[PDB]
Each structure stands twice: as C-alpha cells, then as structure tokens.
Amino acid sequence: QNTVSHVSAACLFSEALHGIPFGVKVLKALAAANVSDASKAREGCQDAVRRAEDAFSSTPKVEEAVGRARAALKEAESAENAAKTALSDVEQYAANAPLLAAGKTAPIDDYLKSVAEDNSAASTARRIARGCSLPNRGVNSWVLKKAVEFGCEFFTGDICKILTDGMADLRAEYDQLEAAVRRASEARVAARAAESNARKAAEEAERTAA
Numbered sequence: 001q002n003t004v005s006h007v008s009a010a011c012l013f014s015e016a017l018h019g020i021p022f023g024v025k026v027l028k029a030l031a032a033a034n035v036s037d038a039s040k041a042r043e044g045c046q047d048a049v050r051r052a053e054d055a056f057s058s059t060p061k062v063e064e065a066v067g068r069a070r071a072a073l074k075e076a077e078s079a080e081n082a083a084k085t086a087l088s089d090v091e092q093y094a095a096n097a098p099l100l101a102a103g104k105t106a107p108i109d110d111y112l113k114s115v116a117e118d119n120s121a122a123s124t125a126r127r128i129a130r131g132c133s134l135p136n137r138g139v140n141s142w143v144l145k146k147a148v149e150f151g152c153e154f155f156t157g158d159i160c161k162i163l164t165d166g167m168a169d170l171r172a173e174y175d176q177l178e179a180a181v182r183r184a185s186e187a188r189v190a191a192r193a194a195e196s197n198a199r200k201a202a203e204e205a206e207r208t209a210a
Contacts, residue, residue, distance in 0.1 A: 001155055002115045007125045009150035011132035014108045016147050019139035020101035020174075024094040026137075027181050031090040034188040038076075038083040041191035045073035048198035055202075055209035065205035072198035076191045083187035086180050093177035100170040141174050 052069040055062050115121050115129035136143065148167050152160035 001159075002118065002121045002125055003154070004122065004125050004128065005154045007112070007115050007128045007132075009147075009154050010108055010111050011128055012136075012143075012150060013147040014105060014112060014132055015134055015136040016139045016143050017101045017105050017108065019136035019143075021098045022135060022137040023139045024098055024177065027177060028090055028094045031087045031181050031184040034184040035080075035083045035087050038080045038188045038191040041188070041195040042073070042076040042080045044195040045069070045076040045198040048195070048202040049073050051202035052205040055205035059205075059209040062205035062208045065201045065208070068201040069198045069205075072194045072201065076194035076198070079187045079191035079194060083184050083191065086184035086187055089180035090177060090184060093173055093180055097170060097173045097177055100173060104166070104170065141171065141178055144171050144174060 049066070049069045052062065052066040056066045112129045112132050116126055118126070121129075144167065148163055148171075151163045155163070
C-alpha cells in the first residue's frame with residue numbers, strides 16, 4: 001500500500017497532525033482578542049450610561065434614553081461574561097487537542113519513512129514521502145475530515161476502520177475548540193451591538209438636553 005495516492009493521503013494526515021500545535025495557538029489568540037474587544041464594548045456602554053445620566057440631570061425628557069443605555073449595558077455585561085466563559089472553554093480544548101494529535105504522528109511518520117527508504121517503491125511515492133515535513137499551519141476540522149476521508153479512500157477497510165475509530169476523539173475535541181472560538185466571536189459581536197445601542201441612546205439624550 002505504497003502507491004502515490006497512499007503516500008499523498010498519509011502525508012496530508014501527518015502534516016495536518018503536526019500543524020495542530022500551530023493552529024491551536026492562533027485560535028487561542030483569536031478568542032483572547034475577542035474577550036478584550038468585548039470588555040472594551042462594555043466599557044463603552046458604561047460611558048454611554050454616564051453620558052445619558054448627565055443629560056438627564058439637565059432634562060427629564062431623556063429619561064427613556066437613560067433606560068435604553070442601562071439595558072444595553074446589561075446586555076454588554078452578559079456578552080462580555082459569555083466571551084470570557086468561551087475563552088475558558090477554548091483554553092481547555094486547546095490544551096486537550098494537541099495531546100491527542102502528538103500521539104498519532106509516530107505511526108504515520110513511520111509509514112512515510114518506510115516508503116521513503118523502500119527501493120521497491122515508485123519514484124514519486126518516495127519523493128512525496130521523503131519531502132513530507134511541512135506542518136500544515138492551516139489545519140482545522142475540515143482538513144482533519146479530509147485526511148480521514150483520503151485514508152479511507154485509498155487504504156484497505158481494516159486501516160480505514162482503525163483510522164476512523166482512532167481519530168474520533170481528536171476530531172471531537174477540535175470540533176469543540178472551533179465551536180468555543182465561534183462562541184467567543186459571537187459574544188464579542190453581541191457586546192459591540194449593545195454598545196452601538198448604548199451610544200445611540202447617549203447621543204439622543206445629549207441632543208435632547210441641548
């Protein structure tokens with residue numbers, strides 16, 4: 001089982017697994033940035049509430065605007081906390097997935113060396129095997145799915161079974177990681193949407209008081 005297609009499949013899988021440590025670092029940073037931005041949005045809501053309160057001091061006619069600002073702050077506070085909870089999830093899954101991936105590289109890389117060093121193997125098969133040392137920093141759940149799919153397309157069913165059964169945990173953890181990252185991003189968008197309403201309330205209050 002050392003045709004060009006077998007080796008191509010194995011190489012994609014190896015570079016995917018070696019890429020995992022790099023990918024998780026990027027995701028953790030995305031989620032952390034999302035929290036930072038969510039907190040900044042909540043701070044902006046706090047400012048908007050202060051502004052509206054001050055306008056209200058001069059003008060009872062902006063009472064509703066203070067209310068809208070306060071409600072928006074409450075929403076931003078909830079979104080901020082949602083972002084922070086999502087970051088904590090990311091951190092857990094980002095610690096878990098690399099442990100699982102690192103433990104799957106040795107058998108794949110042994111296979112690749114076995115072709116690289118096999119004088120009975122076709123030229124291009126050996127070339128691909130020997131050059132297979134570039135981690136795929138773009139790895140994600142989609143790449144891991146394709147990796148399993150290619151293995152199953154080209155290797156025998158017994159190997160497909162071992163590959164499928166054996167990758168399920170990692171793929172589940174990486175899925176959880178991606179979902180947590182999405183939750184962090186959505187929370188940040190929600191926080192900023194609250195701040196937009198808060199700011200519009202403050203702006204209205206100030207116009208009315210003027």
